[PDB]
Amino acid sequence: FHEMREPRIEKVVVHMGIGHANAEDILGEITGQMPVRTKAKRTVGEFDIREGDPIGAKVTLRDEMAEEFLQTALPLAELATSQFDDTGNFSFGLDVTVNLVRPGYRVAKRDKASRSIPTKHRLNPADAVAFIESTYDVEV
Amino acid sequence: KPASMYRDIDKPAYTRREYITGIPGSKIAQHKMGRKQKDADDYPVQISLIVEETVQLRHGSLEASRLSANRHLIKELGEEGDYKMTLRKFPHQVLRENKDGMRAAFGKIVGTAARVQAGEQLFTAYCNVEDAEHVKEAFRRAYNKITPSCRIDSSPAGNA
Amino acid sequence: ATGPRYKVPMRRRREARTDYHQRLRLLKSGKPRLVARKSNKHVRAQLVTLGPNGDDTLASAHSSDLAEYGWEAPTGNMPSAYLTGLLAGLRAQEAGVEEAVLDIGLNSPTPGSKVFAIQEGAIDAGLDIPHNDDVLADWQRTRGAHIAEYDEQLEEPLYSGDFDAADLPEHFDELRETLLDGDIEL
Amino acid sequence: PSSNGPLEGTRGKLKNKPRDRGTSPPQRAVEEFDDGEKVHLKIDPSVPNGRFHPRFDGQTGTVEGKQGDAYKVDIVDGGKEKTIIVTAAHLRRQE
Amino acid sequence: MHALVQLRGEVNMHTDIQDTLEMLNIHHVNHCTLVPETDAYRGMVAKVNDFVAFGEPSQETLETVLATRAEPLEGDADVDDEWVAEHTDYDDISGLAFALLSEETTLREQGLSPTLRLHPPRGGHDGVKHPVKEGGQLGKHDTEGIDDLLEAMR
RNA sequence: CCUGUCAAACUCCAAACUUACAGACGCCGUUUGACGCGGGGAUUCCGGUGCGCGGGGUA
RNA sequence: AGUGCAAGAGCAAAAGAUAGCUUGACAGUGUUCUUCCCAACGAGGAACGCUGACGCGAAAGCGUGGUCUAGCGAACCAAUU
RNA sequence: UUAGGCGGCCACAGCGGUGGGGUUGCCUCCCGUACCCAUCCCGAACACGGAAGAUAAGCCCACCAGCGUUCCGGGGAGUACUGGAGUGCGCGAGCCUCUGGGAAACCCGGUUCGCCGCCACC
Numbered sequence: 001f002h003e004m005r006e007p008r009i010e011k012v013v014v015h016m017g018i019g020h021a022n023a024e025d026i027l028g029e030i031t032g033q034m035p036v037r038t039k040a041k042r043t044v045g046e047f048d049i050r051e052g053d054p055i056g057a058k059v060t061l062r063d064e065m066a067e068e069f070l071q072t073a074l075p076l077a078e079l080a081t082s083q084f085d086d087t088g089n090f091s092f093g094l095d096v097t098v099n100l101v102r103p104g105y106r107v108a109k110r111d112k113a114s115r116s117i118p119t120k121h122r123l124n125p126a127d128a129v130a131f132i133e134s135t136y137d138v139e140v
Numbered sequence: 141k142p143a144s145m146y147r148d149i150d151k152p153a154y155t156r157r158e159y160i161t162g163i164p165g166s167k168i169a170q171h172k173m174g175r176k177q178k179d180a181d182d183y184p185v186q187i188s189l190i191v192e193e194t195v196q197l198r199h200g201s202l203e204a205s206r207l208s209a210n211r212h213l214i215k216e217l218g219e220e221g222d223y224k225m226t227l228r229k230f231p232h233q234v235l236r237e238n239k240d241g242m243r244a245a246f247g248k249i250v251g252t253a254a255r256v257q258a259g260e261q262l263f264t265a266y267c268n269v270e271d272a273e274h275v276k277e278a279f280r281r282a283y284n285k286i287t288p289s290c291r292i293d294s295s296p297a298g299n300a
Numbered sequence: 301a302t303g304p305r306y307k308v309p310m311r312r313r314r315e316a317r318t319d320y321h322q323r324l325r326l327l328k329s330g331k332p333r334l335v336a337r338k339s340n341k342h343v344r345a346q347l348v349t350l351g352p353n354g355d356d357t358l359a360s361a362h363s364s365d366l367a368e369y370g371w372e373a374p375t376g377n378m379p380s381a382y383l384t385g386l387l388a389g390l391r392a393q394e395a396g397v398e399e400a401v402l403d404i405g406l407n408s409p410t411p412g413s414k415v416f417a418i419q420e421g422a423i424d425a426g427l428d429i430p431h432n433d434d435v436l437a438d439w440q441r442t443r444g445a446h447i448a449e450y451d452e453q454l455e456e457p458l459y460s461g462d463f464d465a466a467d468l469p470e471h472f473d474e475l476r477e478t479l480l481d482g483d484i485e486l
Numbered sequence: 487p488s489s490n491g492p493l494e495g496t497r498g499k500l501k502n503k504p505r506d507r508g509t510s511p512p513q514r515a516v517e518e519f520d521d522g523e524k525v526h527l528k529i530d531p532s533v534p535n536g537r538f539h540p541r542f543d544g545q546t547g548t549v550e551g552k553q554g555d556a557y558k559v560d561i562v563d564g565g566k567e568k569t570i571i572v573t574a575a576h577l578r579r580q581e
Numbered sequence: 582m583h584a585l586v587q588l589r590g591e592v593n594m595h596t597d598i599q600d601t602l603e604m605l606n607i608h609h610v611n612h613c614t615l616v617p618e619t620d621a622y623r624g625m626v627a628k629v630n631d632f633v634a635f636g637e638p639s640q641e642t643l644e645t646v647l648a649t650r651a652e653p654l655e656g657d658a659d660v661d662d663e664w665v666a667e668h669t670d671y672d673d674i675s676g677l678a679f680a681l682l683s684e685e686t687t688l689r690e691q692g693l694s695p696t697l698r699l700h701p702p703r704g705g706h707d708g709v710k711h712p713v714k715e716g717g718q719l720g721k722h723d724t725e726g727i728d729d730l731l732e733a734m735r
Numbered sequence: 736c737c738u739g740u741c742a743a744a745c746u747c748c749a750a751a752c753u754u755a756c757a758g759a760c761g762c763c764g765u766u767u768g769a770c771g772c773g774g775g776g777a778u779u780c781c782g783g784u785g786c787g788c789g790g791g792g793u794a
Numbered sequence: 795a796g797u798g799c800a801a802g803a804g805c806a807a808a809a810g811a812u813a814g815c816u817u818g819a820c821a822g823u824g825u826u827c828u829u830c831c832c833a834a835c836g837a838g839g840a841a842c843g844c845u846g847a848c849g850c851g852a853a854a855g856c857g858u859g860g861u862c863u864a865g866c867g868a869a870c871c872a873a874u875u
Numbered sequence: 876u877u878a879g880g881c882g883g884c885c886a887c888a889g890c891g892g893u894g895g896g897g898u899u900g901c902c903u904c905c906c907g908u909a910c911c912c913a914u915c916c917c918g919a920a921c922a923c924g925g926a927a928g929a930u931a932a933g934c935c936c937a938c939c940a941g942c943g944u945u946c947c948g949g950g951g952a953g954u955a956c957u958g959g960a961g962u963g964c965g966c967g968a969g970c971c972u973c974u975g976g977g978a979a980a981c982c983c984g985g986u987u988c989g990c991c992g993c994c995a996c997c
């Protein structure tokens with residue numbers, strides 16, 4: 001019961017929302033895998049009338065790539081309570097986002113007969129702070 | 141202009157403001173009167189003015205009657221008397237006038253009126269057993285300024 | 301749910317199992333559908349026809365009932381899929397069915413996949429099914445070669461329950477051998 | 487009418503009932519009717535093609551063959567006989 | 582079985598109401614017809630309700646009226662028990678009367694004209710501007726009321 | 736929460752009723768031939784009134 | 795929400811968005827309806843076929859322009875294929 | 876159907892909730908990337924290969940009505956409205972009688988936490 005319920009890291013999404021890029025090279029090093037560009041929508045007075053066009057970049061890490069990143073990334077921050085989601089997520093930092101979830105998350109991400117995860121199986125802030133804190137660092 | 145011109149319900153309902161423009165503001169100052177911070181259940185007596193015929197009452201008439209009625213309740217119970225009266229209707233019907241013979245006759249917007257079916261309550265007061273005859277007088281003056289004949293019916297009030 | 305005016309998807313749409321837009325397009329042919337489906341451990345082919353109260357399955361095969369003819373191997377691989385298609389196909393001929401349209405439900409049209417293997421099998425069984433050769437895996441992969449070589453890079457047997465060490469595409473042949481034959485009780 | 491196009495005054499008859507909103511079931515779009523069969527004509531708001539002139543909504547004609555997949559239905563508009571090309575999606579068997 | 586008598590003329594009568602009367606074989610004022618009580622016929626009389634007088638007559642009365650106003654499908658041949666006996670599935674007017682009331686046959690069925698061309702009401706009727714409940718003569722009647730009328734028009 | 740009101744260009748509802756097709760009864764047609772079809776000849780395309788439902792207009 | 799533009803209507807594993815590919819906004823000839831309810835009338839329009847040649851897709855299939863209803867023009871003459 | 880596949884009607888099926896269920900069986904989650912295939916970056920997904928673990932999700936089974944919905948009883952209501960008729964009433968806007976139809980809101984009590992078809996299956 002506890003096994004198929006104990007949390008895990010689904011993805012680590014590191015991105016640098018700039019606004020006009022040359023920053024891809026650093027993320028390519030800090031994470032270990034290829035980054036992707038970030039297009040935008042809606043026109044903006046702030047000389048942002050080009051809907052589709054480079055403005056940022058991101059990397060989504062999973063499994064080892066993810067963990068091996070947090071090992072050196074988490075220490076760089078000072079995690080708190082508010083800094084956590086209502087689903088059990090937390091973003092810090094160049095932004096560093098950690099998406100946590102229980103085992104069978106696939107049920108909501110697969111194509112055939114997908115389904116939305118019941119609130120009971122959804123991770124909790126408290127459950128999140130725990131799991132995480134229970135691995136190389138403090139809370140609030 | 142004579143009410144004879146609009147008192148009847150002989151035209152389609154004309155209320156959609158999304159297709160009408162230049163509608164004159166209402167002349168009705170208030171619909172809630174007396175001590176409106178207090179409820180209606182807080183009174184022993186509840187009297188209403190009932191219209192006896194289905195009609196259309198222009199806002200200038202609702203204001204005249206409501207005024208000449210509340211003005212009495214004020215003069216008899218004081219600018220803060222323990223009473224409360226309500227004009228429950230609002231003039232939704234927009235009225236015109238063709239003010240050029242019958243050519244392009246559709247009229248220009250000139251006012252608003254409330255439609256009242258016979259037997260309905262136009263006004264309603266809630267007073268203490270004391271001021272019961274003071275409200276009955278306020279309505280007498282009120283029905284003297286609206287087209288139809290009215291009944292001054294006494295709802296909750298078995299102190300006769 | 302929210303109110304009187306709320307629109308709730310047809311049951312099978314919310315269960316996320318039927319693509320109606322694709323369905324209608326299939327039905328427009330007037331031919332029976334070779335419904336190819338797959339699970340983690342199994343694969344299944346059905347020849348479905350339209351009916352007054354719901355679809356009508358006129359024949360079908362399942363990877364499970366493959367062993368019933370001499371199969372000791374797993375049932376979630378390519379060799380599995382093809383042979384099942386064929387088994388299902390053969391039975392289809394029995395019931396008088398002659399042509400079909402491939403319905404892969406919510407699976408993707410990936411080149412060389414199993415739903416296509418199921419299709420090549422059903423076609424070899426003798427069913428007239430609109431297809432495209434350069435979208436079917438290469439013969440050897442159907443046999444199960446890709447897995448043998450994967451087992452080549454041994455160190456720890458690929459299969460846990462000893463069906464065999466270096467696995468066998470040669471078995472695929474013995475099983476297809478048995479199906480293309482007459483006798484065989486369908 | 488202020489204008490005389492085909493969809494003039496078709497506000498109600500071509501608007502879907504809230505819950506009937508959205509893509510319609512394929513079953514009745516694929517239905518097969520026989521020559522001689524009586525069928526009621528009623529356009530399906532959700533289905534764009536295969537419609538007949540709205541004016542004929544409510545008719546109950548007779549399948550007298552088909553053109554492609556669409557059906558040829560015979561009706562009598564007032565006193566005049568007319569043939570109507572309509573797809574199953576917009577037809578229903580009678581009785 | 583209800584007796585139907587047209588009491589109001591055709592001038593200004595709705596055409597669909599007039600055609601209905603003719604389908605029930607009445608073509609003139611005062612003419613009377615005998616109609617079975619079926620859902621179909623029911624709708625019909627309900628439609629002609631304001632130009633007619635109807636209701637179930639008594640065996641007796643039906644016998645009086647048949648005797649006095651019944652006619653053959655063709656010819657002036659008088660209709661009496663002897664006629665009835667020699668031309669119908671019955672023995673006399675009574676056997677006929679009973680059969681009609683019980684709805685086993687129809688005048689047309691027994692070679693009799695579907696209509697009884699009655700005579701103006703002796704002493705006049707209660708008026709054609711009001712129904713029975715309002716003191717008039719139009720509409721559904723009492724077996725006793727229908728009898729009073731039919732007899733007055735014998 | 737409570738409390739006061741509306742819609743020709745609003746509708747979660749919803750008639751009476753109008754209307755397609757069929758069967759039944761009725762009426763009608765097979766010497767008075769209906770229904771339908773072809774052809775000859777028109778007149779007519781200033782209308783009005785009552786009642787019902789209207790739209791415009793103080794009327 | 796979006797779907798070029800009035801209004802009403804249609805659309806959510808799409809009729810909307812993005813990406814890629816493509817040129818069916820193609821040739822020939824009809825059926826039907828509409829224009830013109832019933833009920834005759836042209837140009838114009840639409841839906842639905844058959845033949846030809848293609849595009850895309852695994853394939854069913856979709857594409858006779860833009861989700862549907864506005865964006866249209868006789869004879870004579872000229873130019874053109 | 877001791878958990879499956881394709882469906883029809885398309886909320887009576889939605890929303891939310893409680894309880895129960897799986898050693899070589901089923902569906903899953905799950906394990907894992909040599910291949911077919913895959914990500915504008917990620918075997919996340921898609922695709923493929925597979926069984927160490929698991930019944931916590933999903934799913935299937937049993938059930939609860941607070942919200943939404945279908946239908947029914949009773950009340951609202953034969954009211955509102957209305958097809959046919961009237962030398963009935965009203966200064967009139969309008970009303971009434973007889974005949975044939977007949978709601979909606981809302982309250983109260985029930986019902987509804989899907990029904991059905993084909994196939995496969997200890």
Ligand SMILES: [Cl-]
Nearest residue numbers: 112337338405
């Ligand atoms: Cl599947």
Ligand SMILES: [Cl-]
Nearest residue numbers: 538539570827
């Ligand atoms: Cl048409």
Ligand SMILES: [Mg+2]
Nearest residue numbers: 495497498499
């Ligand atoms: Mg309308």
Ligand SMILES: [Mg+2]
Nearest residue numbers: 652654655656
């Ligand atoms: Mg004679």
Ligand SMILES: [Mg+2]
Nearest residue numbers: 706707708709
């Ligand atoms: Mg008299």
Ligand SMILES: [Mg+2]
Nearest residue numbers: 868869870871
């Ligand atoms: Mg000229």
Ligand SMILES: [Mg+2]
Nearest residue numbers: 872873874875
């Ligand atoms: Mg030129």
Ligand SMILES: [Mg+2]
Nearest residue numbers: 895896930931
């Ligand atoms: Mg459980």
Ligand SMILES: [Mg+2]
Nearest residue numbers: 964965966967
């Ligand atoms: Mg009078």
Ligand code: NA
Nearest residue numbers: 037038053054
């Ligand atoms: Na970019």
Ligand code: NA
Nearest residue numbers: 506508510532
């Ligand atoms: Na629909």
Ligand code: NA
Nearest residue numbers: 829837838839
């Ligand atoms: Na034309």
Ligand code: NA
Nearest residue numbers: 930931932933
């Ligand atoms: Na579970």
Ligand SMILES: [Sr+2]
Nearest residue numbers: 149150151152
């Ligand atoms: Sr008027």
Ligand SMILES: [Sr+2]
Nearest residue numbers: 283286287288
């Ligand atoms: Sr007065």
Ligand SMILES: [Sr+2]
Nearest residue numbers: 752753754788
């Ligand atoms: Sr009408």
